[PDB]
Write a protein that binds this ligand. Structure first.
Ligand SMILES: [Cl-]
Ligand SMILES: [Cl-]
Ligand SMILES: [Cl-]
Ligand SMILES: [Cl-]
Ligand SMILES: [Cl-]
Ligand SMILES: [Cl-]
Ligand SMILES: [Cl-]
Ligand SMILES: [Cl-]
Ligand SMILES: [Cl-]
Length: 311
């Protein structure tokens, strides 16, 4: 859509009736005894801020940087996030280590006045490099659950557009992270014949072996996890092998559901599976590079999950 032209900028600075500063920028109307500069094509941005007499009097002595940037859902769904950050944030407001996060719903509502991970956490350094290099990726999500902020899964940012195409739940994010080997800790609660059993992760490792057969890739994923157990009803021997099997099968069916959403609902690989075929199969990679998501959707997965209780 076409907007009216303006080549010069002006600024109004006011103090309002409810005591706050209001800066209204102005897009000055191009001119061909009256005050001509007053005419605008449109008003520009407005800045609202409460500032104390002491803060007008005492200027800042150094340039600080943003620690965390939280992006609202509607913004991420409609706009290239890299382009947005570039447009609104000066490079010197950010550091490599500044955190980037996603909000379900409105981001401003997630920040709340005081009382009295792991995704991964994504830092600006990495997120920007992902965007620039055509990678889909995950960003930790937060939600104001009435509220009370709370970590709540992950946003899925798709390559090219750099837009959020959906969210994974906390459980789905844990499952995906577990199978991919990026998980640090966590618990899997389930049941054995109705009795609650929980498996707490101590150490987990994943090996991924992609094999092309034929024209499409087949990812052989191996998951080895050691953990602690919690019980109800009430040692072993085969009984631990039995519980291990229950936990193993659960992870498998849970990851199948998540992978199905990635392949056929969202149609993107936000966990760098692409990198494994790049290392193991450069020639094949060279041919598919330009349409990896298409290939990802057609890809098959074979899991080998092995749990070990040490409690
Ligand atoms: Cl206009
Ligand atoms: Cl400005
Ligand atoms: Cl104030
Ligand atoms: Cl300061
Ligand atoms: Cl929305
Ligand atoms: Cl890092
Ligand atoms: Cl959808
Ligand atoms: Cl990575
Ligand atoms: Cl191509």
């Amino acid at each position: 859509d076409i907007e009216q032209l303006s080549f010069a900028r002006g600024l109004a600075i006011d103090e309002t009736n409810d005591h706050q500063y209001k800066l209204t920028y102005q897009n000055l109307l191009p001119q061909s005894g009256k005050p001509e500069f007053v005419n605008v094509t449109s008003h520009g941005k407005t800045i609202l801020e409460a500032v104390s007499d002491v803060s007008i009097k005492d200027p800042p002595v150094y340039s600080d940087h943003l620690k965390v940037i939280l992006l609202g859902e509607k913004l991420m769904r409609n706009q290239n996030v890299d382009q947005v950050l570039n447009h609104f944030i000066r490079d010197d407001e950010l550091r490599r280590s500044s955190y980037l996060m996603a909000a379900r719903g409105n981001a401003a509502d997630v920040f709340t006045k005081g009382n009295p991970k792991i995704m991964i956490p994504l830092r600006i350094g990495r997120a920007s490099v992902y965007s620039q290099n055509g990678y889909s990726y995950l960003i930790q999500a937060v939600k104001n659950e009435k509220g009370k902020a709370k970590y709540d899964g992950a946003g899925i940012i798709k390559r090219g557009s750099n837009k959020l195409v959906g969210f994974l739940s906390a459980d789905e994010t844990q499952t995906l992270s577990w199978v991919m080997g990026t998980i640090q800790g966590g618990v899997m609660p389930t049941t054995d014949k109705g009795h609650p059993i929980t498996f707490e992760i101590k150490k987990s490792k994943t090996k991924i072996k992609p094999v092309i057969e034929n024209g499409k890739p087949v990812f052989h994923i191996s998951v080895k996890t050691k953990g602690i157990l919690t019980e109800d009803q009430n040692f072993s021997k085969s009984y631990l092998h039995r519980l291990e099997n229950i936990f193993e099968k659960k992870l498998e069916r849970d990851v199948k559901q998540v992978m199905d959403k990635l392949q056929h609902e969202y149609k993107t690989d936000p966990v760098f599976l692409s990198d494994h075929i790049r290392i193991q199969h450069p020639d094949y990679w060279n041919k598919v590079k330009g349409h990896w998501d298409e290939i990802f959707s057609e890809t098959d997965f074979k899991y080998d999950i092995s749990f070990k209780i040490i409690n």
